[PDB]
Amino acid sequence: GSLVCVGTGLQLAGQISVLSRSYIEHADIVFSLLPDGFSQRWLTKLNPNVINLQQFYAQNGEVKNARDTYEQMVNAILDAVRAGKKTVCALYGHPGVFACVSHMAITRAKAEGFSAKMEPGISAEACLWADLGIDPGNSGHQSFEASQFMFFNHVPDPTTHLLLWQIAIAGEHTLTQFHTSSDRLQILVEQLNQWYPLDHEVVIYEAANLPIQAPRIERLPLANLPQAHLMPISTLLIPPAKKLEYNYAILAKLGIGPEDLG
Amino acid sequence: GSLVCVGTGLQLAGQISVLSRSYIEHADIVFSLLPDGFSQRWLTKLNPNVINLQQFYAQNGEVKNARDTYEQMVNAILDAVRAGKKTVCALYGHPGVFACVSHMAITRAKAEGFSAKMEPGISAEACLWADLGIDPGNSGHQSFEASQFMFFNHVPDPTTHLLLWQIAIAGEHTLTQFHTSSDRLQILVEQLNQWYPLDHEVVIYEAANLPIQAPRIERLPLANLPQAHLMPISTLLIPPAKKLEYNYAILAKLGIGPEDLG
Amino acid sequence: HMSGLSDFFTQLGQDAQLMEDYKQNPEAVMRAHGLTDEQINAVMTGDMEKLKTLSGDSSYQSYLVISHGNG
Amino acid sequence: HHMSGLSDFFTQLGQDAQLMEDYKQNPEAVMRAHGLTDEQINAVMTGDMEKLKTLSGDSSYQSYLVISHGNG
Ligand SMILES: Nc1ncnc2c1ncn2[C@@H]1O[C@H](CSCC[C@H](N)C(=O)O)[C@@H](O)[C@H]1O
Ligand SMILES: Nc1ncnc2c1ncn2[C@@H]1O[C@H](CSCC[C@H](N)C(=O)O)[C@@H](O)[C@H]1O
């Protein structure tokens, strides 16, 4: 058969593509990874033949690797494809943005010589730009996984709008639980304080999943981050700490004088 | 009156969000900045009450202040709102990603006491991740306007997927009119060589605008970029030039070592 | 109870006309969509079960760590 | 007629996954099946529709960013 991975956006029902909605209607079987029961109910009304992929996350009494969690999810998706089924995976937001199951399933389906593609969806950052009235192109944009930013060497350009994703579990590890989330966020604040003042206004952003609720747009000084209540759906926005400065080296090459830049 | 700015995505008719489509359907008047006739025809059949904003771009040659162009676009939008009309402003892709008109119109509508908001849409960024099966979260993601990267001081993180938008007009200026465009891209190539070797594989990406066309995914050595044929719709993807390295200082603060990661 | 809420929330998130009418008079618009006084109140106050499900943040975070920690 | 026929078809094809799967199977047959002429089918199959008048407003956007950060 075939595999199409689609995003449903973040808002219930309205934030999906006309085309992506069409793929779900006509799918023989749908594998879902949605964040709440309302969007699970909405999907099931679109196409009754839904398999819910979060049964593959560690349940009560289990400890499960990310490797085995995803392997089991991909295997289940690939079984329906192997059975000659027109299979559609329905993920929230964009199925390939800060998510690897869909990329993994598509890689494996092609390897076995089946037709597999990804349809772009409206991700959390796409929602952020709209809700905060910020243009990522204005002074540029950087996105990092919060924990990756702590464990590995990422040097941010503080002229840009910086997004730290999965901020709630920043630095989390079964060996770093002697530190509280507040303790880990304090360590992250010390690290960010290398480029950003402790009084630098940051924004805790949570796009609305329902049409009856406003998004969370909590502005606060960087120093107060460790005391913030954070959810699995929290994204941290760190606006620019620095104005853009002319690149005098490259202007000189081009033959432009800074006063000739309007 | 009210204002709602929506994006139609990059693919004709199918990449618009179900709710964004409905806002267009129900709008008393629609101001469009769609790039081509096919999307203009599609919009027209959805809602005949369309005013083209493309008229406000410099018409008799090329000596207009961009701030004036956008000032007039915003003014034409607000005049429909000021007349108590349900106004919708339809942009391609995401109305707020590497575009300023919608943010400007919404800012000034809000400031004049009118209900104004932006509905997220599917941007060229979002199509790139799907079409190239790349996760921006994998090693992080950076987006810069190519010309802003040349004229101003940006530091790329070569562990990340780096996007240079509007790559075709990299370094365009009245003072660089007589530059041959390969000359301009050669300077960009030299600049980038601080972080990226000359044989480093880069990708010229163009998301399909029509359902009968496949995307352009052109792989080539960074060194050959000045010889490349580039379109206004071309985006340059620069994959990582470096593996992620362990942040030993932050790891020690957390009480774990590299060996604990994996 | 939640079956009616779910069906009303789906329409509201899809219809631009319903979204506007709702903004103007949410109570009256919910009455007209056959929603109980219990349900109206729960929506107006924000005191209503969100039906949040197990997020995969920890599995995605851990997978990213295991991927670049193999070198 | 020529351009109206292509626009209606493209619009349908871009919105319907069923139709889009068929079009990938038999492009000529599906287009022929939707009342498109051989001239229309020819414009599509190894022909035009791309590289035709577009206006993405990149110049005015790059200039705006330059003068708004030009601090002059
Ligand atoms: N409602 C929401 N508001 C803000 N960020 C959100 C969000 N839902 C998910 N996220 C972000 O996404 C992370 C989970 S990873 C999945 C992201 C999803 N593919 C997307 O396209 O958005 C969260 O930790 C958070 O950083
Ligand atoms: N079809 C396409 N494929 C790839 N990149 C594209 C594109 N159309 C526009 N772009 C990118 O966007 C720039 C124009 S700025 C407008 C961007 C639009 N708001 C969006 O959401 O995508 C181009 O110079 C290019 O970098």
Numbering used by the authors:
A (entry chain A), B (entry chain C): 2 to 263
C (entry chain B): 0 to 70
D (entry chain D): -1 to 70
Show passages lifted from the paper:
Here we report the discovery of type IV borosin natural product pathways (termed ‘split borosins’), featuring an iteratively acting α-N-methyltransferase and separate precursor peptide substrate from the metal-respiring bacterium Shewanella oneidensis. The α-N-methyltransferase SonM from Shewanella oneidensis MR-1 iteratively methylates its substrate SonA at two residues, SonA-L63 and SonA-I65, in an N-to-C terminal fashion on the core peptide. Complexes of SonM and SonA form dimers of heterodimers. A five helical bundle at the N-terminus of SonA, now referred to as the borosin binding domain (BBD; 1–53), serves as the SonA leader peptide and is homologous to a portion of the fused clasp region of OphMA.
Mutation of SonM-R67A produced an inactive enzyme, that when co-crystallized with SonA and SAH, was at once unable to maintain normal contacts with the top clamp, while still binding the cofactor in a manner that allowed the bottom lock to close. In fact, the structure captures an intermediate conformation between the observed closed conformations (e.g., apo or SAH-bound wt structures) and the open conformation of the SonM—SonA-BBD heterodimer. Concomitantly, helix 5 of the BBD (2.5 turns; as observed in the wt structure) is entirely unwound in the SonM-R67A—SonA-0Me—SAH complex. Comparison between the wt SonM—SonA-2Me—SAH and the SonM-R67A—SonA-0Me—SAH complexes highlights the extent of the change and reveals that unwinding of the BBD’s helix 5 appears necessary to allow the longer section of the core peptide (SonA 53–71 of SonM-R67A—SonA-0Me—SAH vs. SonA 62–71 of wt) to enter the active site in the form of an α-helix. We note that the structure is a pre-reaction complex but is not in a productive conformation: the closest core peptide backbone NH group to the sulfur atom of SAH is “i−9” (6.4 Å). However, the SonM-R67A—SonA-0Me—SAH structure suggests SonM-R67 is critical for the top clamp conformation, core peptide configuration, and the positioning of the complex into productive modes.
